[PDB]
């Protein structure tokens, strides 16, 4: 009976959640959506009358328009699709359940084998990212052992204080480039970090595509290795974060009677 | 040794198989990418003749186009952004990693919150699913102890079988609702589902976004509990495949001399 009051608890917690979530977010964008449409709305109309073209003919110049980024066209200059670096990127995202998008199969045959690629691909990631934990958390415990001079393993606390310190160095160093090179602002910088490292991947920030890009050879492998490292020390963290959560419905659980 | 040895192979593993895949995905989409970026060229040139148009007017006129579809401007119809309704699909595609990317914070202020709110509620849902396996697995060995009528536990495979199974059908029964409401074939609703279940979430095809939508009312919460069920299932399929994985690689190692 244990099991189903957590369970039932915790369901009910993400409901609250969730429903407070939404009332802070829409009083934060509401209005700034709102200005954003009546903003295009204007230029639209503005558009219209300055060349006299017909509402419909734009809609269709606008679907047309669509469905050709749907493709991969772009008013800037980007790299080509599927040449071979860009299916190499593609897969690096599909496997990493990270999605952002910018990619995606267009033929039939191109979407059963995404499937099975897909099946076949997330676990061994996971499996990958599992052990990466492991090997971090004996490396930690030899490294602790040997400053002090088995049963010298840390404790959750101390591996959740450290990881969140490497996240925060690998966001910095990542976020000291991602900057210049690509016209980016340090705060938005982070925030690509953040959104890129826990696969959430919406999509609207996507790095390495401007076709020249300078040197382009040791800039493609850094990304690389970067994001990699991110979404590492990203999956431990949230890891151990569950971990306490878990902790701490018990603790709730205890103190309800 | 052993630890390390398995660490390298399946690294090795990985990025032969990042080189396959890449390769293969190349192949199949190359083709089809070059035509379609040659038909957008045609239809540019087509527009741009007809209406004795300048090129850097549709340049601009298309780099204001863009900035609208940020703000959620469509072409057809789309239900508004940053209403009650749409701020808990936001909040709902951001606690399970899924990322469509359809909605995005714009503002400073909405990224912090963005952070802070992602930190805190993605170890709640990952422990959510994994509690919600373990009840799965106690329920199917209750199931099984009853039929045959603790230490009735399934094994791997069968768990494994069962949890397919379960995702095969959620999947069916989802396009069989998806195909007719929607536009959309049912192999596309079926590749939808996969890309939506495994929180990949690539952002071409999104489901429920097209402002009156008939009942509407019992629609979303049908679409709201199939998403769940599905990301739940695939999830555990996942976790089930990533201990068979491990299994063989430990195999593989053994075998080696
Ligand atoms: C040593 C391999 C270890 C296993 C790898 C596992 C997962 C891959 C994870 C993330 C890769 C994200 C895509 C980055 C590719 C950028 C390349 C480019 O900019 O073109
Ligand atoms: C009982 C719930 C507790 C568990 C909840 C955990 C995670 C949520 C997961 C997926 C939700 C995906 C978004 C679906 C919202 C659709 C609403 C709409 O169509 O407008
Ligand atoms: C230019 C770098 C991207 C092309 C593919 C590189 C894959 C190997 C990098 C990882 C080292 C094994
Ligand atoms: C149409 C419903 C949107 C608001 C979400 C809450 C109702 C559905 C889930 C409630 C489960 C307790
Ligand atoms: C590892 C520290 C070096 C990363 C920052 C380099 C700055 C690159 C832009 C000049
Ligand atoms: C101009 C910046 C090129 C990237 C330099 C970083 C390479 C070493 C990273 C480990
Ligand atoms: C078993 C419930 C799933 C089937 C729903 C069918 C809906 C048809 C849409 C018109
Ligand atoms: C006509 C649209 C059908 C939506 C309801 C589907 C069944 C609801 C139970 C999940
Ligand atoms: C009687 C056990 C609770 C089941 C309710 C369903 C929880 C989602
Ligand atoms: C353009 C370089 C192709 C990839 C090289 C792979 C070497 C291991
Ligand atoms: C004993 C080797 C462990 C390697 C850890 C490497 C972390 C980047
Ligand atoms: C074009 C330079 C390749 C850089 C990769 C370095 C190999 C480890
Ligand atoms: C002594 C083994 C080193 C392993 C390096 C692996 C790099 C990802
Ligand atoms: C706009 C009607 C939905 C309000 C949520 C109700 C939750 C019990
Ligand atoms: C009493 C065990 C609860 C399991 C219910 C699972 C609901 C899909
Ligand atoms: C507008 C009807 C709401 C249906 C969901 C209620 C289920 C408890
Ligand atoms: C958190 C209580 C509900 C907020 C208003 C819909
Ligand atoms: C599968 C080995 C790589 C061949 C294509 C570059
Ligand atoms: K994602
Ligand atoms: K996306
Ligand atoms: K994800
Ligand atoms: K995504």
């Not at 073209?53 to 110049?61: A, I, K, T």
Request: include cysteine; aromatic fraction near 16%.
């Amino acid at each position: 009976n244990e099991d189903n009051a957590r369970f039932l608890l915790l369901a009910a917690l993400i409901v609250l959640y969730l429903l407070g979530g939404a009332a802070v977010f829409s009083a934060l964008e509401l209005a700034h959506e709102r200005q954003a449409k009546q903003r295009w709305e204007e230029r639209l109309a503005q558009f219209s009358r300055g060349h006299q073209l017909s509402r419909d003919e734009l809609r269709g110049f606008l679907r047309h328009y669509e469905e050709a980024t749907r493709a991969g066209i772009r008013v800037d200059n980007v790299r080509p699709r599927w040449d071979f670096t860009g299916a190499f990127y593609f897969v690096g995202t599909v496997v990493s359940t990270i999605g952002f998008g910018m990619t995606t199969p267009a033929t039939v045959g191109g979407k059963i084998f995404l499937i099975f690629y897909g099946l076949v691909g997330c676990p061994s990631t996971i499996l990958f990212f599992n052990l990466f934990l492991e090997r971090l958390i004996t490396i930690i415990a030899y490294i602790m052992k040997s400053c002090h001079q088995a049963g010298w393993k840390p404790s959750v606390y101390y591996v959740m204080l450290i990881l969140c310190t490497a996240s925060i160095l690998i966001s910095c160093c990542a976020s000291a480039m991602y900057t210049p090179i690509e016209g980016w602002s340090y705060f938005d910088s982070l925030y690509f970090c953040f959104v890129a490292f826990s696969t959430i991947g919406f999509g609207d920030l996507v790095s390495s595509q401007n076709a020249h890009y300078e040197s382009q050879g040791l800039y493609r492998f850094a990304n690389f290795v970067f994001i990699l490292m991110g979404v590492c020390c990203i999956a431990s963290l949230f890891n151990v974060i569950s971990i306490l959560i878990k902790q701490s419905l018990n603790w709730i659980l205890r103190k309800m009677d």
